[PDB]
């Protein structure tokens, strides 16, 4: 084979349609389904799979008690076929660690996993199932990565890392990898102030990433990466549509070389597709909780500080619990453009449901269409009382 | 394909990083996971798998009562993907027997398994999934083998066997196999006095094996095998760092043409990487029990009887139960050197935990790195009370 190149444009997005859904909790009630968090979707040239970090226990086991904590020596990155639940008998382990990211470059898959204590943390870069290279910490404060998939161009796969306070300035770096090896890295630049958990996609040029600001505001940072030059810049989305959670109420005028204030030290992973007029943003419905989920068509959101939605679609009702979301694409599909897709984590259990001592998620994902299609709701459908 | 040749050197080892972990017991609490012992790791040209001897029962079944005994007609060698638990639905059986070893020569896999009564025991050599050759006993006292993987060079795979008292002199032999057939064998020679359960790795020349002395001392034997000449020698490690378990307290000066005394008729499987300055030894923390595990960098340990550690890493805390350990390598990986790796068995249940009537293990493994990475702990994380 050869390396995948970013040559096609994005398809026009008129509506979204369902791509996949595992119903992991509904199944888990009576079967050997693993407890997971932080799911994402990624495709190889001929296959799409779900990825997630498991807790080293099944939903109904007794070791499911306390799964609310996310950094432990029992966590690992697993992969399983789309729309199947993450069962113990069909999952493959990709790596070990409490935080990770992965992607395919057209020849093979790269996977980066972070493990260790909060200070003396480390990351191991795997390629084609072999460990290749390692990274130690620099700030010594819970090294973090993207969670969602990475995008490669001609063999080069930029990856975003953070080490430092999650409630203050932090040192972030972009590493450029090829076949698992480090070509170079850069200190992050531009006007964004705090970067975490970036969701990225490529088009015909560079790679665009939507990230979380977990310090000052509800205004998401955007990173623009040029994989050939291996250079980048950053800014916030200039739009009076806030997308983080929690968030203050939407202003009439947005700003973008400064985070929009009002909700400190918090936020969630999310995504956007920025394409001039063909621009869509995702967010929760609730401004105070991880509940509901919607897509809004907001033309020129990246640069127009008075832009407002002109079209949209409800994915998850605000009556239903939501979770982290992010973007993905099939870069090997036939056609002259890429079909944009995204996924949403549906979180059940603690801390919102205190009747159980575990936490878990189900996953739903959707892809764009050029047709105007109808809409429906996508809850996980699990009855918490069945687990009591 | 062709045969694998031992042509590359060892990589510099500055630190160890996690390679894999199954969490078999934590999962087993609520699922159909098999009871095993004596795990090891071995790789084919494109895949790494865990190997272990199963007891013919699941952890939560009623036949798990009494699994403490290790020689029975219900034992078999199984293989399953790295970091997955040894479940009943994803394991492949390689052979039947209570003691075994295996390895890949670049074209196919060889597997040797021992079965039978304590006196009229026998071994069957399999190759490419067919039985090829058989070996009967010579001393008639529980024929034993290496447990961990074997190393092949240009098709020849030396294997170490023992038949005789485990508490006195015994007859040991080295067999040289090719494509499952016996080319020759040799009575063991050199100055080592008692050899069991050898852990071997190759470099650019020969094959180096670290073995257990289960009779006179805490000073591990080393066997040096030349696979081309099909000849060998032996000695003990000349280092005042004892590595067996139980062991007396470390002396100031070691010795090596005689076992270091003080703890008779006991000991465990373990390993070392001997490479002049780039020398690392593994051992338990406890001197009296199979608890904890650490790696020590002890330059020139093979020959310097006053050498002491200059660097090290804790793998398992002494608060946690440990078990057998050993070495392995991926001999098909890209690069100019071999990345050294090792594994540790974590034993749970009887005889240390008398609240349950079974025994089982979880497995963790690590590989070297040239970077200086931090360290963490790797317990299995199972709550014994959940099984009561």
């Amino acid at each position: 084979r050869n390396f995948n190149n970013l040559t096609k444009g994005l398809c026009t997005i008129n509506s979204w349609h369902i791509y996949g859904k595992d119903n992991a909790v509904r199944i888990g009630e009576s079967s050997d389904v693993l407890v997971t968090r932080e799911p994402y979707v990624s495709c190889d040239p001929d296959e799409c799979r779900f990825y997630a970090l498991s807790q080293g226990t099944t939903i109904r086991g007794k070791h499911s008690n306390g799964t609310i904590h996310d950094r432990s020596q029992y966590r690992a990155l697993i992969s399983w076929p789309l729309s199947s639940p993450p069962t113990v008998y069909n999952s493959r382990v990709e790596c070990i660690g409490w935080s990770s990211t992965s992607c395919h470059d057209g020849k093979s898959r790269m996977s980066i996993c972070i493990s260790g204590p909060n200070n003396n943390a480390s990351a191991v870069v795997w390629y084609n199932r072999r460990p290749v290279a390692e990274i130690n910490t620099w700030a010594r404060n819970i090294l973090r990565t993207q969670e969602s998939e990475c995008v490669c161009h001609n063999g080069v796969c930029p990856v975003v890392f953070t080490d430092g306070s999650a409630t203050g300035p932090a040192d972030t770096r972009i590493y450029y990898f090829k076949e698992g090896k480090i070509l170079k890295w850069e200190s992050l630049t531009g006007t964004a102030k705090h970067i975490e958990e970036c969701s990225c996609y490529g088009e015909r040029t560079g790679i665009t990433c939507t990230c979380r600001d977990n310090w000052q505001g509800s205004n998401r940072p955007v990173i623009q990466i040029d994989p050939v030059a291996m250079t980048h810049t950053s800014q916030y989305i200039c739009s009076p549509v806030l997308t983080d959670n929690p968030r203050p109420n939407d202003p009439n005028i947005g700003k973008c070389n400064d985070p929009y204030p009002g909700n400190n030290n918090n936020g969630v992973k999310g995504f956007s597709y920025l394409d001039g007029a063909n621009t869509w943003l995702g967010r929760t419905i609730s401004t105070a909780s991880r509940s509901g989920y919607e897509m809004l068509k907001v033309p020129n959101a990246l640069t127009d500080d008075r832009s407002k939605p002109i079209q949209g679609q409800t994915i998850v009702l605000n009556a239903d619990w939501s979770g982290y979301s992010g973007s993905f694409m099939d870069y090997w599909a036939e056609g002259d453009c890429y079909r944009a897709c995204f996924y949403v984590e549906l979180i059940r259990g603690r801390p919102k449901e205190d009747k159980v001592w575990w936490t878990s998620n189900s996953i739903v994902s959707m892809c764009s269409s050029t047709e105007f299609l109808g809409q429906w709701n996508w809850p996980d459908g699990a009855k918490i009382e069945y687990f009591l | 394909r062709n045969f694998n040749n031992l042509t590359k050197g060892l990589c510099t080892i500055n630190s160890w990083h996690i390679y894999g972990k199954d969490n078999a017991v934590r999962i087993g609490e609520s699922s159909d996971v098999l009871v095993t012992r004596e795990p090891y790791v071995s790789c084919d040209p494109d895949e790494c798998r865990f190997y272990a001897l199963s007891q013919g029962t699941t952890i939560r079944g009623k036949h798990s009562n009494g699994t403490i005994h290790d020689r029975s007609q219900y034992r078999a060698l199984i293989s399953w993907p790295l970091s997955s638990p040894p479940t009943v639905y994803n394991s492949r059986v390689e052979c039947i027997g209570w003691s075994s070893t295996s390895c890949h020569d670049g074209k196919s896999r060889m597997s040797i398994c021992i079965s039978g009564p304590n006196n009229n025991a026998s071994a069957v050599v399999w190759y490419n999934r067919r039985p090829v050759a058989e070996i009967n006993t010579w001393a008639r006292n529980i024929l034993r083998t290496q447990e961990s993987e074997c190393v092949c060079h240009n098709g020849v795979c030396p294997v170490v066997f023992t038949d005789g008292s485990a508490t006195g002199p015994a007859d040991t032999r080295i067999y040289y196999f090719k494509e499952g057939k016996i080319l020759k064998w040799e009575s063991l020679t050199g100055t080592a006095k008692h050899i069991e359960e050898c852990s071997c790795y190759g470099e650019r020349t020969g094959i180096t094996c670290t073995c257990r002395d289960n009779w006179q001392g805490s000073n591990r034997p080393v066997i040096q095998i030349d696979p081309v000449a099909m000849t060998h020698t032996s000695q003990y490690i000349c280092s005042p760092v004892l590595t067996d378990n139980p062991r007396p307290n470390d002396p100031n000066i070691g010795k090596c043409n005689d076992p270091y005394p003080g703890n008779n008729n006991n000991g465990v499987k373990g390993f070392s990487y001997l490479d002049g300055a780039n020398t690392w030894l593994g051992r338990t923390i406890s001197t009296a029990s199979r608890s904890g595990y650490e790696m020590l960098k002890v330059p020139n340990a093979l020959t310097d009887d006053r050498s002491k550690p200059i660097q090290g890493q804790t793998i398992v805390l002494n608060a946690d139960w440990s078990g057998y350990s050993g070495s392995f390598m991926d001999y098909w990986a890209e690069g100019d050197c071999y990345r050294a790796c090792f594994y540790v068995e974590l034993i749970r249940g009887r005889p240390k935990e008398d609240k349950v009537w079974w025994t089982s293990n979880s497995i963790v493994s690590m590989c070297s790195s040239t970077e200086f990475l931090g360290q963490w702990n790797w317990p299995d994380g199972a709550k014994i009370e959940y099984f009561l």
Partner: antibody, heavy 129, light 109 residues
Framework: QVQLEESGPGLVKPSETLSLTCTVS?????????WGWIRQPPGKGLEWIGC???????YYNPSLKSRVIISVDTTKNKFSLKLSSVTAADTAVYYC??????????????????????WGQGTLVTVSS | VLTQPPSASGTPGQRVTISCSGS????????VNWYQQLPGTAPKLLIY???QRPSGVPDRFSGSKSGTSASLAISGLQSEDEADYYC???????????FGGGTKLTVLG
């Protein structure tokens, strides 16, 4: 010897933001030790709130973060604590303290996590109508 | 949260101990500190790094840790040692200073 002293209102109404300031004297805080705050309800034990340094590398108690801000003014050798939406449960003695952890004291022979060696005398804050 | 008994006691001159315990994310991995609070003031650090003490702390105060539990031993109990004693440790799940509440040590007489 560095001295620490808390000051601010002893009374805040419910829902209001509480603001306390700790003045540091005898030491320039731009030098890097972490400074932070501890709470002690009148009949209870101690609770850590958070700490920060001159570079803003803050740490906060997860139960309070997003409600609480700790900042450092190197120019005036002062640091301060702010908590939005105070409630009855926030009545407590507040203390400011110095923390030499994270090798911020400029030593690598120290425990990474050390403890809090310098304490101010503290102040009592009541939340009431 | 760390666990401590609510009280401890002994007569002058006796050796008494205060225990502290729970989890693998905190004292089970990191070091443990002990602080002493008198009724009218801020707590003083007595023990850090499991068994070290700051200059000025009497050697009658001796810390020890094993497994997932720890203790403070007070030799030569004095009337002046009546106090609220606290156990504390960094806990990686929260990533910041967990306390065990306190133990009231009463000197009898």
């Amino acid at each position: 010897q560095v001295q620490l002293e808390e000051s601010g209102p002893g009374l805040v109404k419910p829902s209001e933001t509480l603001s306390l300031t700790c003045t540091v004297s005898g030491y320039t805080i731009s030098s890097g030790y972490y400074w932070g705050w501890i709470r002690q309800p009148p009949g209870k034990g101690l609770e850590w709130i958070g700490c920060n340094n001159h570079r803003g590398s803050s740490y906060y108690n997860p139960s309070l973060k997003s409600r609480v801000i700790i900042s450092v003014d190197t120019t005036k050798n002062k640091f301060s604590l702010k908590l939005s939406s105070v409630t009855a449960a926030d009545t407590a003695v507040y203390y400011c303290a110095r923390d030499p952890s994270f090798w911020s004291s400029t030593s690598r022979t120290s425990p990474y996590y050390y403890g809090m060696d310098v304490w101010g005398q503290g102040t009592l804050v009541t939340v009431s109508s | 949260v760390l666990t401590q008994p609510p009280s401890a006691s002994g007569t002058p001159g006796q050796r008494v101990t205060i225990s502290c315990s729970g989890s693998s994310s905190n004292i089970g991995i990191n070091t443990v500190n002990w602080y002493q609070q008198l009724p009218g003031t801020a707590p003083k650090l007595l023990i850090y790094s499991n068994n070290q003490r700051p200059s000025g702390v009497p050697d009658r105060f001796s810390g020890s840790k094993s497994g997932t539990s720890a203790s403070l031993a007070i030799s030569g109990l004095q009337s002046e040692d009546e106090a609220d004693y606290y156990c504390a440790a960094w806990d990686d799940n929260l990533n910041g200073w967990v306390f065990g509440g306190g133990t009231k040590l009463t000197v009898l007489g």
